[PDB]
């Protein structure tokens, strides 16, 4: 009778995430930023501010930071925007695992929307 989360669809609507990180790193990696292809989270550091928020995951597209639209950002300017966003960082994110999966070898999306790497 357990109720497993792993079969519930991951929400695909945009979300607001507010991370308070003072003057430390946010604790995640981004990929993308080839010509408007999107900026995606590829890795969240265990114990970092992004992990502690509990509200971001690999495969999230970063739509904006502090009101600055990053949908069509280059990866380096995205990184600059994130690193210079200040102590309070307001991210709009949207889970886009299909688009993310193009970047990571042998990765695909299962029926709940989770990214699987074989």
């Amino acid at each position: 009778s357990p109720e497993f989360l792993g079969e519930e669809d991951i929400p695909r609507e945009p979300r607001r995430i507010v991370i308070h990180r003072g003057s430390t790193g946010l604790g995640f990696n981004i990929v993308g930023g080839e010509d408007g292809e999107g900026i995606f989270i590829s890795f969240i550091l265990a114990g970092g501010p992004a992990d502690l928020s509990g509200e971001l995951r690999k495969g999230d597209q970063i739509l904006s930071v502090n009101g600055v639209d990053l949908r069509n950002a280059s990866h380096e300017q995205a990184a600059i925007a994130l690193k210079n966003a200040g102590q309070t960082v307001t991210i709009i994110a949207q889970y886009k695992p299909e688009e993310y999966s193009r970047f990571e070898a042998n990765s695909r999306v299962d029926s709940s929307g989770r990214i699987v790497t074989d």
């Binding site: 990696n29 930023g33 080839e34 990866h75 995205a78 970047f103």
Partner: peptide, 8 residues
């Protein structure tokens, strides 16, 4: 692909 990856 112009691929790059940054830590933030």
């Amino acid at each position: 692909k112009n691929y790059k990856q940054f830590s933030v």
